Amino acid sequence: SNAMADKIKVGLLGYGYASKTFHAPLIMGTPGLELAGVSSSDASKVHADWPAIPVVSDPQMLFNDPSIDLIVIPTPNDTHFPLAQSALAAGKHVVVDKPFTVTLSQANALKEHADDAGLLLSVFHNRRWDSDFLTLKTLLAEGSLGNVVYFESHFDRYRPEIRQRWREQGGGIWYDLGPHLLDQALQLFGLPETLNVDLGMLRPGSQSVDYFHAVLSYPGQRVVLHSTVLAAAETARYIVHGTQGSYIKFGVDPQEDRLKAGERLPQADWGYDMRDGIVTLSHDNVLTEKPLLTLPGNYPAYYAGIRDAIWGTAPNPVPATEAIKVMELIELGIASDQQKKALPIIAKN
Ligand SMILES: [Cl-]
């Protein structure tokens, strides 16, 4: 179908931080997609941003609307499955935010129910479109670092004050940030042989996990995923070592802040990351170095991808299949931490 002359009507569920910050602005900015309606308690909270405000007070009404094609579910973690089921039952396509589901049993159920009903089911791993990650994918594809042997990925922050993330996730940031990092690691290197996770609470007053250090092990490779809320000094986002060179990048992707600030698509300079990383290469037993041009972040690619998948033009940007694998590693991290062991990944096709 045409993204010029045809529209996929979308139903958004609730107006939480996610709907407000990501889903609304991004669906709105995507040609071919039309945000038909949003279910919410306080429409006034919505209209302040997006009137027309075809607001409804109950998600089941959107499910009812027969013209609606797609349903996005960024509500509280525990509602995902119910709402998701209801949605697939109503014969509607579904995008679920993270965490996918409270249970693997649930996730797979949706994967099946959605597959039998010929509907599209996808999860919002938007960070596959972070400026740094895109740039990196391209660097590896070109092979200048040689054979990659080490990958280090951090989201280190400094918030010593205990008032940020209500409520809890036991959580804590492993549930909140793990999925993003794990998914990237899988996308770049596939499945590891073992996962070893060390969860922590280093901040006095923390109620949930506020620290995690994960090691994913591969034949001749190591991947280190790390986060913390007690890092006053800025640390590298990525550190990548190959047999021929290295790549170190600082900063985070800049889209989230600009969306928070209320910016609407399109922007001449959407996603520009002016904080370039640096490549170091060994040419003739000499180490040279230069900055690597950072590709702009591109979250919109997700919904444009969803659009195109609905119309059957292209592959689901993020299959449930892949979300479920990340979810499995999230649980395996918990187990690994409980046993203080590097646990093996199992049960592959
Ligand atoms: Cl080894």
221 alpha carbon to ligand 1 midpoint, in Å?
A: 6
Q: Which amino acid is at 123?
A: V
331 alpha carbon to ligand 1 midpoint, in Å?
A: 25
Burial of 317-344, coded b for 16+ CB within 10 Å and e otherwise, reads bbbbebbbbbbbbbebbbebbeeeeebe
- The verdict on 230 and 198 lying in the same domain is yes
- The verdict on 183 and 291 lying in the same domain is yes
Q: What is the C-alpha separation between 108 and 301, in angstroms, rounded?
A: 26
155 alpha carbon to ligand 1 midpoint, in Å?
A: 26
- The verdict on 67 and 122 lying in the same domain is yes
- The verdict on 72 and 21 lying in the same domain is yes
Whether the bond between 242 and the residue before it is cis, its omega within 30 degrees of 0, is no
193 alpha carbon to ligand 1 midpoint, in Å?
A: 11
CA–CA distance from 282 to each of 142, 159, 193, 197, 315 (Å)? 16, 39, 30, 33, 38
- The verdict on 252 and 282 lying in the same domain is yes
219 alpha carbon to ligand 1 midpoint, in Å?
A: 5
What resolution, expressed in A, was reported for this entry? Answer: 2.8
145 alpha carbon to ligand 1 midpoint, in Å?
A: 18
220 alpha carbon to ligand 1 midpoint, in Å?
A: 4
181 alpha carbon to ligand 1 midpoint, in Å?
A: 22
Q: Please count the residues of the chain.
A: 349
Q: What is the C-alpha separation between 128 and 52, in angstroms, rounded?
A: 31
Question: Which domain does 333 fall in, by range?
Answer: 130-297+317-349
- The verdict on 42 and 136 lying in the same domain is no
Structure determination method:
X-ray
CATH number, position 302: 3.40.50.720
Q: Report the DSSP beta bridge partners of residue 209.
A: 171
- The verdict on 85 and 181 lying in the same domain is no
DSSP 194: E
Question: Left if phi > 0, otherwise alpha if psi is -120 to 50, otherwise beta: which for 325?
Answer: alpha
- The verdict on 80 and 115 lying in the same domain is yes
- The verdict on 187 and 96 lying in the same domain is no
Q: Considering its fold, how many domains does the chain have in total?
A: 2
- The contacts of residue 52 (CB under 8 Å, 6+ apart) are none
- The verdict on 78 and 214 lying in the same domain is no
CATH number, position 282: 3.30.360.10
348 alpha carbon to ligand 1 midpoint, in Å?
A: 22
218 alpha carbon to ligand 1 midpoint, in Å?
A: 7
187 alpha carbon to ligand 1 midpoint, in Å?
A: 20
CB 309 within 8 A of CB 335: no
The closest of 125, 81, 83, 73 to 106, measured between CA atoms, is 81
- The verdict on 170 and 95 lying in the same domain is no
Instruction: Count CB atoms within 10 A of the CB of residue 100.
Output: 28
Q: What is the C-alpha separation between 253 and 256, in angstroms, rounded?
A: 7
Report residue 34 as tokens: 């039309």
Give the helix/strand (H/E) hosting 82: helix 80-89
Q: What is the C-alpha separation between 64 and 36, in angstroms, rounded?
A: 13
- The verdict on 18 and 134 lying in the same domain is no
